[PDB]
Amino acid sequence: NRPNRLIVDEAINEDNSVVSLSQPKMDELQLFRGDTVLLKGKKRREAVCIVLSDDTCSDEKIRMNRVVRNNLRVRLGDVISIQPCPDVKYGKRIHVLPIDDTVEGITGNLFEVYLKPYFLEAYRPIRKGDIFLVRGGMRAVEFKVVETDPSPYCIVAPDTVIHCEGEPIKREDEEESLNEVGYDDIGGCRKQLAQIKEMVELPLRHPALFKAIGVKPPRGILLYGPPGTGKTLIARAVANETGAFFFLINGPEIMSKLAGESESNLRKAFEEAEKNAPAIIFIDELDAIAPKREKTHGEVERRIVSQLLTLMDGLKQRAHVIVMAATNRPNSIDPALRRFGRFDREVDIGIPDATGRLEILQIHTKNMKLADDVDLEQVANETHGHVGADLAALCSEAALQAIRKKMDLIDLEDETIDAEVMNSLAVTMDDFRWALSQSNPSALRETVVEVPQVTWEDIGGLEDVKRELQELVQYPVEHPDKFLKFGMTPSKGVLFYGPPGCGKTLLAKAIANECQANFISIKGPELLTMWFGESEANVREIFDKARQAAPCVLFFDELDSIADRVINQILTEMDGMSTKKNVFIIGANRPDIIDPAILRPGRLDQLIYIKSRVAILKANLRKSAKDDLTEICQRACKLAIRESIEVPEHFEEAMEMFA
Amino acid sequence: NGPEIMSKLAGESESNLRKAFEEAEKNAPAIIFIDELDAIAPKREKTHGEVERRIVSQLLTLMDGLKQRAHVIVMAATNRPNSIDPALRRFGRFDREVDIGIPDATGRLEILQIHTKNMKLADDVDLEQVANETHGHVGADLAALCSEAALQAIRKKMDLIDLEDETIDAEVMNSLAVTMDDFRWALSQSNPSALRETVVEVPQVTWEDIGGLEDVKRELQELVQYPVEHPDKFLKFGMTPSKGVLFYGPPGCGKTLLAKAIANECQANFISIKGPELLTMWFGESEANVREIFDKARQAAPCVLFFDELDSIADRVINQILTEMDGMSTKKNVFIIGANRPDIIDPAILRPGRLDQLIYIKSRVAILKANLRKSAKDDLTEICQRACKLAIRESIEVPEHFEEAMEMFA
Numbered sequence A: 001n002r003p004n005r006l007i008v009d010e011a012i013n014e015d016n017s018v019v020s021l022s023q024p025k026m027d028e029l030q031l032f033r034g035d036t037v038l039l040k041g042k043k044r045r046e047a048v049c050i051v052l053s054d055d056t057c058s059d060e061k062i063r064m065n066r067v068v069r070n071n072l073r074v075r076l077g078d079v080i081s082i083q084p085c086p087d088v089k090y091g092k093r094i095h096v097l098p099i100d101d102t103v104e105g106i107t108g109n110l111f112e113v114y115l116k117p118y119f120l121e122a123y124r125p126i127r128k129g130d131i132f133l134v135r136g137g138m139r140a141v142e143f144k145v146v147e148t149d150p151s152p153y154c155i156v157a158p159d160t161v162i163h164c165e166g167e168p169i170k171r172e173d174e175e176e177s178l179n180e181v182g183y184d185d186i187g188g189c190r191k192q193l194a195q196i197k198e199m200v201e202l203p204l205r206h207p208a209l210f211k212a213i214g215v216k217p218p219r220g221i222l223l224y225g226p227p228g229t230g231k232t233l234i235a236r237a238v239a240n241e242t243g244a245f246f247f248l249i250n251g252p253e254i255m256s257k258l259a260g261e262s263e264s265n266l267r268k269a270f271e272e273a274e275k276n277a278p279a280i281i282f283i284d285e286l287d288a289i290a291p292k293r294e295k296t297h298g299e300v301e302r303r304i305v306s307q308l309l310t311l312m313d314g315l316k317q318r319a320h321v322i323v324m325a326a327t328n329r330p331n332s333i334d335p336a337l338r339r340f341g342r343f344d345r346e347v348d349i350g351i352p353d354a355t356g357r358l359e360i361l362q363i364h365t366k367n368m369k370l371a372d373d374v375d376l377e378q379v380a381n382e383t384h385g386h387v388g389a390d391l392a393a394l395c396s397e398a399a400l401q402a403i404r405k406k407m408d409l410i411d412l413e414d415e416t417i418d419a420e421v422m423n424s425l426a427v428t429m430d431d432f433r434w435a436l437s438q439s440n441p442s443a444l445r446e447t448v449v450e451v452p453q454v455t456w457e458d459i460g461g462l463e464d465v466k467r468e469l470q471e472l473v474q475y476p477v478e479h480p481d482k483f484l485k486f487g488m489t490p491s492k493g494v495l496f497y498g499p500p501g502c503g504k505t506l507l508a509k510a511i512a513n514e515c516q517a518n519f520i521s522i523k524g525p526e527l528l529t530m531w532f533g534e535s536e537a538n539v540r541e542i543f544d545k546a547r548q549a550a551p552c553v554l555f556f557d558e559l560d561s562i563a564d565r566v567i568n569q570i571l572t573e574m575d576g577m578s579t580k581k582n583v584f585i586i587g588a589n590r591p592d593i594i595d596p597a598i599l600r601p602g603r604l605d606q607l608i609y610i611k612s613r614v615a616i617l618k619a620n621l622r623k624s625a626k627d628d629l630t631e632i633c634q635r636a637c638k639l640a641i642r643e644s645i646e647v648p649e650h651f652e653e654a655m656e657m658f659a
Numbered sequence B: 001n002g003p004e005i006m007s008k009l010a011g012e013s014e015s016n017l018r019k020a021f022e023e024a025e026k027n028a029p030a031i032i033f034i035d036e037l038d039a040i041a042p043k044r045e046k047t048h049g050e051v052e053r054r055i056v057s058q059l060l061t062l063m064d065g066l067k068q069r070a071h072v073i074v075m076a077a078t079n080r081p082n083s084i085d086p087a088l089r090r091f092g093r094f095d096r097e098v099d100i101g102i103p104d105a106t107g108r109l110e111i112l113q114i115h116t117k118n119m120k121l122a123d124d125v126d127l128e129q130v131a132n133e134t135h136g137h138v139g140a141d142l143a144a145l146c147s148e149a150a151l152q153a154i155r156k157k158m159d160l161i162d163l164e165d166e167t168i169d170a171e172v173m174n175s176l177a178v179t180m181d182d183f184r185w186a187l188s189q190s191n192p193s194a195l196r197e198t199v200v201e202v203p204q205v206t207w208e209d210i211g212g213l214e215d216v217k218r219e220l221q222e223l224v225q226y227p228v229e230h231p232d233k234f235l236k237f238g239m240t241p242s243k244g245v246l247f248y249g250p251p252g253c254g255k256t257l258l259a260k261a262i263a264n265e266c267q268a269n270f271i272s273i274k275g276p277e278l279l280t281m282w283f284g285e286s287e288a289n290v291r292e293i294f295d296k297a298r299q300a301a302p303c304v305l306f307f308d309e310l311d312s313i314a315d316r317v318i319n320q321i322l323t324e325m326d327g328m329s330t331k332k333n334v335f336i337i338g339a340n341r342p343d344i345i346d347p348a349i350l351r352p353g354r355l356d357q358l359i360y361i362k363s364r365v366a367i368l369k370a371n372l373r374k375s376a377k378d379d380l381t382e383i384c385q386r387a388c389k390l391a392i393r394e395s396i397e398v399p400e401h402f403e404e405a406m407e408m409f410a
């Protein structure tokens, strides 16, 4: 019913002048490639840009970056009308202007700097009144098309004289900034972002629905993670994204107010968020305001939490507010905010994976002229355990470096601090090398969630167990119905005991690869020691970030390290682990100091043990002449590389009771 | 609302509680319900305040001030005996405990049913199923589920169909159905993580899941199957029934599946307090947590208690379980089972007034029949499982394997 209309979705191609559809739709709409389309959005707007194809598009959702989307006064979810519009004629005169707030500080001629680079061989269809963004000179510039000759919309051709006077246009009310915290600004946090998104989607963008309805719509949204994971952003952006009024509550701020005035604030906090509703009240650094754990010692520290819990209930479904809190971990927060009616929806944000950090890194360089030798992916690679902040700060450092070298030293000619300068000012792969080898690479590490990369290629011999695990996992994850035709239910865990350097680990990380499910490597030394004292509570937390990161396979290497608390605790959270969910559990030199209970059912009821020393030499020199296991292959790669520096091709020089 | 009553200026707090009763004593009969009390009156070791102390008082000053003629029944909701101040327990204040607990198999169903008495559930919505896989949830958990699952429907079908237009009206929601795929989504979320604890269920397993050793089988039925159905037949001899029994021996022997069974023949609940568990996964220094167990024990009667893996641990925990063992009103349905190391076992536990009954655990030929019942026609289970597998893995590759799988103390 009404084919020409489709639901706006985020864009894959960040290029302003393009909207991409799915092929079947485009044929249904007699649309080709270079095809120029017309777009009628909300508030009576029209945005004529170019349409393309896209395999991951929806047969009814038109992908489109925020520019083309704000130029329609549309949010993500609203549906627009597309219509082929090939009757556009090469402009003649394109009189434009910069929104006075993206230019405050840049001197010189904009045109030459941002305009020309922008249009040169693009022919970007443009329509009178469109606000488009240009990233150059190490920042962002918003330009408003004031008057276009082939009116309304024309195609900026090479012969279309593009005028630019000198009276930056004041930013009109409704024309929200494009420099605004957006979805496109958050990277690496895909799957979980996607979760915040649906929770609010309904109550936040479809208000009335919760009037003609009587259903419990989340109110409190808690975000977990370590400082710099990007909660604020993910927050300010989901609000800035769905047209909600965003009202912030900086936790340290709310404490730095006279003993009492504190309250009044939180109250106005909600008293103002309940005004412009839909609205998201974001409590930043909550663990500072409401940490009623064993740090709760105060005649006023207690009144505050109350006052907030008195409001974290006071809000009715009709209020149209979704309160979002950002704490660090289950224990930083008061166990009373967990009540069902307050902050009941946890969303774990975590450390960005290999790909993440890249996106992230990419996201913060969308302005600086990176060099041809800047392999951002590289930067992403050697940075193993960083968070957003760490990664962003890096781009600033690395960047400032450029500016600290080339430019001001060249002060000698003079101080032309202008556009053309920053514009051509490049940041080479040596600027990141400097930024990285600093006093900032020291990132606050913790337990990471990655997607196993190693397959069965890095494990030779013992192919006995290999064809076994694939049956307790490679079948209940891809073949769900084949496991309801027998009656029996899958195992919750398994155990791998034996001598060191045997293969257990490289196997546990492997088994997950064949299921594309994450992994969690909780080393033995580690829970007890390097984490937090008396942390039988830290253990339940592990499972939280475990069952949540599903599909996944858990693995506690070196279980012999430790019926005591820790063990018994890992055992308790082992039974309460919703079996009917993707939460596998591996185990790990001393089958004696091992509590038999761990051997017992409902836990590690599976018992395994670890030709071999002939093929484990092939998968140990693959990426490495043609004539403990690795303790030798390494003493060779060395005497082999030390023999060259002194022709890349050594060895002679290197040379059951329990079962 | 307890947090509410604390979030008021140091002092105004009182005035409230007073009007609280000053208004409830007006429209009386009336029930003054103190929500989240453990926040107001937790005079346990968290009682550190020149004002935290005045409040509790002020309330205890009223929790007495009320006369029979007042016509008010004050109801408090706390989490456990220790969350509350031991002074509210005085006879005259809050003296009547009513333990609400985690909903059993049937419960969760009703519950689930109760929150869908409005949404057009689909013909393929087996609510009982939802009830089944959700083992340890509470009301909230279960309700929140219906909302999630529900919103799901509304988040799919409807607004996507925004394309026609936004007719948010009755006929829409009316025909808007919530399928068994909406609950599948709601369940496989970040909410199924329910706050588990010790549950009270009605043993389902009978004597069918235990073959061999029918010696003890015809024994327990005499210390329970007779004093629960035949009360007078136990006052015609003089002797009084045993308060407990003990089952020691090698692993995977049958003790547990027996303790849960013995209760089934009496339709009496059961409580499985695993060994690792009291000490570890509960709360530290919890010789007080142990008396609590008996509280939720004698209360859930008729019932049979069972501490599996007693060898895990005269120390506190044990001695404590022993103390609350004598003070356990014998003239009430409070049986007590026990549970690989008859050495690290304090003889006192062997002694009378406790586990004066001592038992030990054909067999490995019939324990194979009750292990393949609901499962060809040509440690005990450590094999029957390696078979059901190589049997189902042999099909995915026709539902019918084995060859492939293959006293000092007494």
Ligand SMILES: Nc1ncnc2c1ncn2[C@@H]1O[C@H](COP(=O)(O)OP(=O)(O)NP(=O)(O)O)[C@@H](O)[C@H]1O
Binding pocket: A458, A459, A460, A498, A499, A500, A501, A502, A503, A504, A505, A506, A507, A557, A558, A588, A589, A616, A619, A620, A628, A629, A630
């Ligand atoms: N099957 C294998 N294939 C390739 N390399 C292996 C294999 N087994 C052991 N290694 C090498 O031996 C070292 C120990 O590897 P790993 O398998 O990760 O530990 P582990 O045997 O599981 N540890 P542990 O639990 O203490 O016995 C590594 O540096 C590997 O390169």
Ligand SMILES: Nc1ncnc2c1ncn2[C@@H]1O[C@H](COP(=O)(O)OP(=O)(O)NP(=O)(O)O)[C@@H](O)[C@H]1O
Binding pocket: A601, B209, B210, B211, B249, B250, B251, B252, B253, B254, B255, B256, B257, B258, B308, B309, B339, B340, B367, B370, B371, B379, B380, B381
């Ligand atoms: N009599 C029995 N009938 C059927 N199955 C049994 C029997 N005894 C043991 N099993 C199996 O053995 C495993 C251990 O069962 P269970 O009887 O519950 O423990 P237990 O012997 O009481 N434990 P423990 O106190 O450590 O010796 C289970 O998976 C059962 O299926």
Ligand SMILES: Nc1ncnc2c1ncn2[C@@H]1O[C@H](COP(=O)(O)OP(=O)(O)O)[C@@H](O)[C@H]1O
Binding pocket: A185, A186, A187, A188, A189, A226, A227, A228, A229, A230, A231, A232, A233, A234, A326, A352, A359, A360, A363, A387, A388, A389, A390, A392
């Ligand atoms: N996942 C990410 N992708 C891109 N940028 C990120 C991400 N996480 C953090 N950042 C950047 O790091 C900084 C940290 O932001 P913020 O959300 O406020 O931190 P916090 O998690 O402490 O609240 C921001 O300026 C943001 O742009």
